[PDB]
C-alpha cells in the first residue's frame with residue numbers, strides 16, 4: 001500500500017519500569033553490553049551516551065513472541081555477532097520459539113525456528129545464560145532448553161540446531177504443577193565454558209551445565225560435549241541460578257530453593273575447585289539468618305577471588321548484596337542492622353533519572369524507598385572495570401561506577417542505569433486537549449504517568465490512590481482537568497485504599513472517592529474500564545468482577561447500570577454528557593440517561609467472541625466516540641475465526657455502523673488533530689490494510705490510509721492502546737506490551 005516515513009521515539013520513563021532478568025557483558029570488547037527482557041526484546045549499551053538502544057523493534061505482529069528474550073549470547077571472537085533464544089511462553093499461550101542471529105550487533109536479524117517453545121516470560125528466566133558461544137571456536141553454540149527438551153547445539157554459528165542426545169538430565173523441577181502457567185519442567189539453567197581447555201580454532205573441551213533438578217543439578221563434559229557427567233560431590237536440595245568460573249579454577253554457584261523470579265525462601269552458595277575437586281559451602285548467610293535464595297552471581301575479572309552475590313528474594317526490609325575478596329571465605333554485606341530497627345548502609349540510591357521510583361512513599365529503615373531492589377536474579381561486574389556493576393530488578397537496571405569504594409570503607413553510589421529502556425505494558429492512553437500534558441498513561445506494575453516533556457522522566461508516582469496497575473483512564477472532554485482512573489487497590493496492605501482515583505487538576509493530584517461499587521456481598525476488586533461523561537458530571541465504571549456501575553455523586557455512591565452486561569466495553573459520548581455507549585458479545589448498547597439504563601441497538605457483524613470456542617469477556621475491542629461530534633463512534637476489533645474483523649463507523653449514536661470496506665483487519669482506533677485544510681480529526685489505527693500489517697493514518701475519514709510505521713518499528717503485539725494528539729497534527733502515541741509508549745511524527 002502507501003507509506004509515509006515517520007520518526008519513532010520512546011516516551012521517556014527514565015527507569016524502564018519492567019524486569020530485566022539478564023545483563024550480558026562481552027568478554028573481549030570493553031563497554032559492549034546487552035540486556036534482555038521478558039516481553040520487550042533486548043537492548044545494547046552505548047558507552048558514549050550511557051544509554052541503551054533496543055535491538056528488537058523489527059519484531060512485529062505475527063512474530064510477536066520474539067520479544068520474549070530467554071537467553072542472549074555475545075561473541076568474544078567476533079563481537080559483531082550476537083544471538084538470542086526467543087519465544088515468550090511454553091504453555092498454551094504461545095507457539096514454538098527460535099534462535100535469532102545477528103552479525104551487526106542486533107541491527108538486523110535472521111532466525112531459525114526451533115521445534116519447541118522458548119520461555120522468555122516463564123519462571124526461571126533470570127537463571128543463565130542458557131545460550132552460549134564457544135570462546136575458542138565461535139561457530140559452536142549450546143542452548144539449554146525448557147520443558148524436557150534438554151541440551152541443543154549448533155556447529156554452524158547458529159543456523160542449524162540439533163539435540164545433544166548424550167545430555168542425561170533434562171530437568172526435574174516444576175514451579176506450578178497444578179496451574180496452567182509454569183506446569184512444565186523449567187529445564188536447563190546455565191552453561192559455562194572453561195576457556196582454558198581450548199585454544200583459538202579448537203573446540204573448548206570442558207563445559208559445565210546447570211540443571212533445574214534439586215537431586216543432581218551440575219553437569220560437566222571434559223571431551224567437548226561428547227560425554228556428560230554429574231559433578232561428584234555436589235550439594236543437593238537446591239536449584240543453581242548461575243555458575244561462573246574464576247581463573248583460579250573455582251567454579252562458583254548460587255542456589256535458591258526456587259527458580260524465581262518472585263520466590264526463593266532458602267539458599268546456598270558453593271564453590272568447586274576444578275583442580276583439587278574440593279567443594280566449599282560459602283553461603284553468606286545461613287540458619288535463621290537465611291530466608292531467601294541466592295540469585296545474582298558476579299565475579300570480578302580483574303581480581304580472581306573477588307565476587308558478589310545477591311539475595312533472591314529476602315523481600316524485607318530490602319534485598320542484600322554480599323561481597324567477598326577471598327573467594328567467599330568471608331563476606332561483607334551492603335547493609336547491616338544497628339540497634340533495631342536502625343540500619344547502616346554501604347550504598348546510597350540515586351533515582352534522579354526516574355524520581356517516581358520512590359512510589360510516592362516516605363523512606364524508613366524498615367520500608368526503604370527506593371529499595372536497593374527485588375528480583376535481583378542477575379548481577380554483573382564489568383570485566384574491564386571492577387568499579388562498575390549493573391543489576392536488574394523488577395523495575396529497572398541499577399548500577400554503580402564506584403563499586404570498589406566498598407572495599408575502602410566508602411559508600412557505593414547506585415543510580416538508575418536504564419536510560420533508553422522502556423518495558424511497560426500500556427493498558428490505556430489519553431492525550432488531553434488542554435493543559436500542560438499531552439499524554440497520560442495507564443500502565444501495568446508502575447501505574448502510569450502524566451508526561452510533560454516526552455524526553456524528561458516523570459517526577460511523581462501516582463498516589464492517593466496508589467496501586468500497581470491502572471487498567472483504564474478517561475477525561476471529561478468539555479472539562480479536561482477532570483479525569484478518572486481505575487485500577488486494583490491492594491487492600492491487604494492498605495485496607496482504606498480505593499480502586500478508583502479522581503483528579504480535578506488534569507491528573508497532577510488525585511483523590512479517592514468515599515465509596516466504590518458493591519453488591520450485597522462484596523466490594524469490587526476494581527480494574528475493568530472507566531468512562532467519564534462529556535462534562536464530568538458522571539462516571540461509568542465497568543468493573544472487572546461485579547458489573548457496570550454509574551455515579552452522579554462524584555463516587556459518593558454507585559448504582560448498577562440497567563441492561564448492560566458485566567464485562568462490557570464502555571465509552572462516553574464526547575459532546576452529550578447524558579450519552580454513553582457499551583458493547584459486549586457482539587451487541588452494541590446506548591444510554592441516554594447518563595449511564596443508568598442501557599438499551600441494545602441493531603448493530604450486526606461485530607465479533608461476538610461467542611461462537612466456535614470464543615469467549616466474550618476477553619475480546620479485542622477498541623471503541624471511542626469522537627471529540628466534538630455527538631453520536632460519532634469508531635469501533636475496531638475482531639478475529640479471523642468469526643470473519644468479523646475490521647473498522648466500523650457510526651454517525652447515529654450506534655444505531656448502525658458502516659464497516660469500512662478498505663480495512664481487512666483492525667484492532668485499535670484513535671484520533672488526532674485534523675490535517676491542514678481538513679475538518680475531521682485524523683484517524684490512527686493498528687490494522688492490516690492493503691495486505692500490510694502496521695500502524696496507519698487517515699486524513700479523509702477513512703477513505704484512504706497511509707502506513708506511518710515501517711518494518712524496523714513494529715513493536716510486536718501492538719493491540720494495547722493508540723491515540724492521536726488533538727493539538728498536534730500527525731502525532732501518534734502508540735502503546736505496546738513490553739516496549740512502553742512510543743510517539744511519532746512525520747519525517
Ligand SMILES: OC[C@H]1O[C@@H](O[C@H]2[C@@H](OC[C@H]3O[C@@H](O[C@H]4[C@H](O)[C@@H](O)[C@H](O)O[C@@H]4CO)[C@H](O)[C@@H](O)[C@@H]3O[C@@H]3O[C@H](CO[C@H]4OC[C@@H](O)[C@H](O)[C@H]4O)[C@@H](O[C@@H]4O[C@H](CO[C@H]5OC[C@@H](O)[C@H](O)[C@H]5O)[C@@H](O[C@@H]5O[C@H](CO)[C@@H](O[C@@H]6O[C@H](CO[C@H]7OC[C@@H](O)[C@H](O)[C@H]7O)[C@@H](O)[C@H](O)[C@H]6O)[C@H](O)[C@H]5O)[C@H](O)[C@H]4O)[C@H](O)[C@H]3O)OC[C@@H](O)[C@@H]2O)[C@H](O)[C@@H](O)[C@H]1O
Nearest residue numbers: 018019262265288291315316317374393394395445492493
Ligand atoms: O517471608 C518469608 C519468610 O520470612 C521469615 O521471617 C524472616 C523475615 O521476616 C519478615 C517479617 O519481619 C517482621 O519483623 C520482625 C522480624 O522478622 C524479626 O527478625 C524481628 O526480630 O522482629 C520484627 C518485628 O516483629 C515484619 O513485621 C514483617 O512485616 C515481615 O514480613 C514481611 O513484610 C514485608 C512487607 O509487608 C508489608 O507490605 C506488603 C503487605 O502484603 C504486607 O501485609 C505488609 O505487612 C513483605 O514484603 C513484601 O513481600 C511481597 C512478596 O510476598 C510474597 O513472597 C514472599 C512471602 O514472604 C510472602 O508471604 C508472599 O506474599 C512483595 O510483593 C511483590 O512486590 C513486587 C514489587 O512490587 C512485585 O513485583 C512485580 O511483579 C510484577 C508481576 O506481578 C504479577 O505477578 C506476580 C504477582 O505476585 C503479582 O500479584 C502479579 O500482579 C512484575 O511484572 C514486576 O516486574 C515486578 O516488579 C511482586 O508482584 C509482588 O509479589 C512486596 O513488595 C514486599 O513488600 C514480606 O513478604 C514479609 O515476609 O525477614 C527477617 C527475618 O528475621 C525473618 O526470619 C519467616 O520465618 C518465614 O516463615 C517466611 O515467612
Ligand SMILES: OC[C@H]1O[C@@H](O[C@H]2[C@@H](OC[C@H]3O[C@@H](O[C@H]4[C@H](O)[C@@H](O)[C@H](O)O[C@@H]4CO)[C@H](O)[C@@H](O)[C@@H]3O[C@@H]3O[C@H](CO[C@H]4OC[C@@H](O)[C@H](O)[C@H]4O)[C@@H](O[C@@H]4O[C@H](CO[C@H]5OC[C@@H](O)[C@H](O)[C@H]5O)[C@@H](O)[C@H](O)[C@H]4O)[C@H](O)[C@H]3O)OC[C@@H](O)[C@@H]2O)[C@H](O)[C@@H](O)[C@H]1O
Nearest residue numbers: 018019038039093121179180181394425444445717719737
Ligand atoms: O495463571 C496465570 C497466572 O499468571 C501470573 O502472572 C504471571 C504471568 O503474567 C503474564 C503477563 O505478563 C506480562 O508481562 C510482565 C512480565 O512478566 C514481567 O517480567 C515484567 O516486568 O512486567 C510485564 C508486564 O506486567 C504481560 O504484559 C502480559 O501480557 C501477560 O499476560 C498474559 O498474556 C498472555 C499472552 O497474551 C498477550 O500476548 C500475546 C497477544 O497475542 C495477546 O493478545 C496478549 O493478550 C495471555 O494469554 C492468553 O490467555 C487467555 C486466557 O487467559 C485467562 O487465563 C490466564 C489468566 O492469566 C488470564 O487473566 C485469563 O484471562 C487465552 O484464552 C489466550 O488464548 C491466550 O492468548 C494471558 O492470559 C495473560 O495472563 O507470566 C509472567 C509472570 O511474570 C507473571 O507473574 C499471575 O500473577 C497469576 O495471578 C495468574 O494469573
Ligand SMILES: [Cl-]
Nearest residue numbers: 338339340342
Ligand atoms: Cl538506633
Ligand SMILES: [Cl-]
Nearest residue numbers: 433434435436
Ligand atoms: Cl492549555
Ligand SMILES: [Mg+2]
Nearest residue numbers: 008057712713
Ligand atoms: Mg529507530
Ligand SMILES: [Mg+2]
Nearest residue numbers: 022023024378
Ligand atoms: Mg548475566
Ligand SMILES: [Mg+2]
Nearest residue numbers: 355356358360
Ligand atoms: Mg522522592
